[PDB]
Amino acid sequence: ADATLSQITNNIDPVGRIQMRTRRTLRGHLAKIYAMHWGTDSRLLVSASQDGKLIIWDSYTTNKVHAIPLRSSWVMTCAYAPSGNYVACGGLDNICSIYNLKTREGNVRVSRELAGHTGYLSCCRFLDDNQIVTSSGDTTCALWDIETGQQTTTFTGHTGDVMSLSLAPDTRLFVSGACDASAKLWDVREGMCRQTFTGHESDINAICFFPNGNAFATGSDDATCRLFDLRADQELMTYSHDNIICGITSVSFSKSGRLLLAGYDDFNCNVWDALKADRAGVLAGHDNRVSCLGVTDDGMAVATGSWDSFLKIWN
Amino acid sequence: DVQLVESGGGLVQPGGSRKLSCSASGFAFSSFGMHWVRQAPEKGLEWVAYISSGSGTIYYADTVKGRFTISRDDPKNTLFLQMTSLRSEDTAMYYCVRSIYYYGSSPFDFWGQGTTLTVSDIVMTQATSSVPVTPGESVSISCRSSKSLLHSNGNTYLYWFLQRPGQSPQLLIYRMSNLASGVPDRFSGSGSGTAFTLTISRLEAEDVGVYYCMQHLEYPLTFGAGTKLE
Amino acid sequence: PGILYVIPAVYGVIILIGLIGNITLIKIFCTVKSMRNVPNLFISSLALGDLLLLITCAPVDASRYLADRWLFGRIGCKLIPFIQLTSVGVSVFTLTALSADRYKAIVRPMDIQASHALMKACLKAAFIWIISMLLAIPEAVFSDLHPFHEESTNQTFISCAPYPHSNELHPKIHSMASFLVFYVIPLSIISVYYYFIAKNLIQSAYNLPVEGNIHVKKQIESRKRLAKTVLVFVGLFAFCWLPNHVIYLYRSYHYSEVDTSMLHFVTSICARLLAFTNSCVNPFALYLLSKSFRKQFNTQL
Amino acid sequence: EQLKMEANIDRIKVSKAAADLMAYCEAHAKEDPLLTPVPASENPFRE
Amino acid sequence: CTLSAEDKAAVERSKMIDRNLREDGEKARRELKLLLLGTGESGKSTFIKQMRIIHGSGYSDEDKRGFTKLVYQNIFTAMQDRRREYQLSDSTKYYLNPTQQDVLRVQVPTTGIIEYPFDLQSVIFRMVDVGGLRSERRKWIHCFENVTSIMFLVALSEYDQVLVESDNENRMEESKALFRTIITYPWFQNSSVILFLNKKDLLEEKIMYSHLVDYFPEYDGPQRDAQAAREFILKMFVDLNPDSDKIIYSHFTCATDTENIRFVFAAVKDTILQLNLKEYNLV
Amino acid sequence: XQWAVXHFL
User: Fold this and answer.
1) Listed GO cellular component terms (chain A)?
2) Do chains B and F touch (3 or more CB pairs under 8 A)?
3) Does a structural domain hold residue B228?
4) Scanning A109, A274, C95, E240, which has its CA 20 to 30 A from the CA of E162?
5) Is the CB of residue E22 less than 8 Å from the CB of residue A64?
């Protein structure tokens, strides 16, 4: 530890005030929205809600492309296949369901139901069209083969429930954050844990890779967001405000990695300059907890879902 | 899998009325809009009617508007086309065509076998009707439009179909570049606002047939004359 | 002129209290921004109607007793009854709407949301207002300055009256029909609904699904209190609206003759104070019923 | 066993990682719409 | 007007989808969510089976072949007069001394959220049993923030039982701590609390040989009366309410009760009645 | 001399 990150970026120009306005508002969910995932095309997005509905939406025109009825209304996570053919949903039923969007009878039907975990599914993220990695409240992360239907790898080092998962850009490493305040970097091919980080003092509810892939950020029930390097193997910064005392539901980066956007239980989202750790903007549209925050692959917009059942696109 | 099988054609005395019907199988019929298209005995093919998903919208061809009626029994999975005051321009082959419209879909992807009926805007032009080419040579077909088919949303609404002898039309390319599912990567499409070109590299015996361009920017849905490869 | 000072020394005091209360309820609905819902919509419409009644109808009555001449003039004499009767109609009919809304909530607590409720509720308020305008219109058509011949002072004074002397049946028909529609039918409907509400609130009290009767004693008392307050709401409205609908009817039957006597003077003032009192007993009684609404009221004050 | 294995991980100094993170942010600054907003003609949302 | 022919067809699809969402929401709100909390009595999970028999649902031979292995597993687990001092199955005597009875008393832990739909008087409810979750409740308790009622099930014969795994801790004091912790949750501030007291018959026999005063010093009653013990226990539970304005509905269930559904309806109807009174500013 | 005989109110 030669120096702190804030000492090196002391002589850098501040971002300045960030102003973002709702350019769209997606209405239709009738219950709390728990999860959202943008598509790779950067126009389509999927969102999951407790009324038992998974909805694919066109962002540009606010049009609803697809509406999928789920078997278990208790869903906590949502994912969109990088190709665009598939969506995955899971929740308190302990099953990860894969549905196909580009099927030839017009309807969206379930392709496979992956049932190996004993705890609730908290996150799932497609690795290819045939490989998905899921995190569970049973303290274990599993890498599956969608065609066969069997989990090829299990990551078991965690002691508390795993709440969030994030895949590296190269899709060879991922990081998981757990209820024991530890985040672990897991190698997907070997199946072991390369590193563990323990800077937080309460449950980690959110985790996200920096665009470079050599860093990541966590958000916890304690109000702080923490940035952790992978090569230095140490915490770099903490993003906290005396006024902020609520939990952090979701965290995500900007395309350049200069802005870190975090969704809070104070009903509003914050935008931090990730290199000076000083708050730069707010997103105050929602009137309930901001449950999901996702930025696009090109950085054009930021969608925020919430427990008031509306999604909002900001730019 | 997906089958549309129409029925109701035959020999009709002039001035009578006939009702056609296509029965659908193997797909979510209720979520598909439907079209009727018709082909003259030796001429090209022309659009006839369009009923929307949920029946909220209906468009008829100016030629038959007011003498034709289109309806869909979504629960029974059938599509009906009532025809009254049958003129002698109604001798044609009637093809049921399903189409679905959302961001990224491919309309006009499946066509039905067709029924025979015998009774006793934008213009799209292809200035060629016979191009005999040996297998193994690139073939470029051209098609021109009255106005620009490029919309403000950046989409150029030109579709390319193929008609194999004794077979129903089949979609090759939609919106000027995209390839339909199940077509070989040999077929490619590239066009300017008013001029369009379809290129078939490594020609094969299956490609021989009549090629039709079509527009979807406005609702006349005007086809082309067709270019034949022998 | 001491008796005249007593008249606004009282009329103005009552008007002030009523304006304060109704205005505070109007403030609560807009300021909270979450208090907006089906029940609060009907109460807000009643408060609006009561505001119109207090702001317009009463000062004209104070002017009547204070000055013999009609200050408003002809156009004004055609404008004033159209507001008075409309305000009376809205108030008396939104009260019936509240009584049926409460009955639906309390006696049948099934499917309260009923799909597009807020829209239906916004529509029922406007429909009541439109009907009130329709009823007022005939009282703006026939309202004009007419001559009245006192038999005591033997003086022919011209005053703003609802109908012309030429007609002897139109007065009686309008007075009787106005009474039957503005008092009897609303009271009949409110009586039935609030009787059913109280019956159920008491039957629910002793039927509480709890094994230990002691643990819920307070709750039982509260239910038994709500029934009595609803029956009191049926009585107040009756009392206040009976003498005004009696003095008016009497004056309209003996239309040609003008009665100036001490009995008639005092009875007329008392009937007008009682009728105006209903606008202030409407919000102030709900104020007493709820402690949370009391906290909201005091915040708005 | 797991802790003894985690102890062998290579650890570059924090100055190097700070420099890499800063340099990545400088390299892709222009391509980032939220940091430097796009003119409204190119904006897909509210064109 | 500025839209194309396909854009208009896309908007027509988004309108049909909106219609379907609204119809689904109308269908959804007519259902009332009841959250059954998992205690040690609920962990045993025999009461739910017996209440199911009361509804009319039964077991085919296939289902009983399902429970064979569980029966044998139970004999071994129990084996591996002084029951109250240690943890033991309630049905050890009957086994050591499959029929429908054998099926009923196979104490089995549950994998995840199990939902039971039941319809009474045109009102349909869903009983969401969360007993077998076995994961941090702080991370999934919000899901049921908005529910009509949080049902609890505790046994009346639990006052003398001290479990071996605890270091001399009374099981009833453990159930009381759980009850207080749940009802103090801010998520359920708008949700009714229903409490069911079970094992009514087992208390009638247990009270004669076991004095409640020995385990709880406050009890001052006949010392041989089951009626007094029941009322004392219910008083201890109801006293934990931190509001004093919210009712805590109660019932004594004997495992042969045929009124457990009617009580749940009457408690839910009165929950709704009070919510209405609060929203109309009458209370 | 106005209060004597008037409208509904």
Assistant:
1) cytoplasm; cytosol; extracellular exosome; extracellular vesicle; heterotrimeric G-protein complex; lysosomal membrane; membrane; photoreceptor disc membrane
2) no
3) no
4) E240
5) no
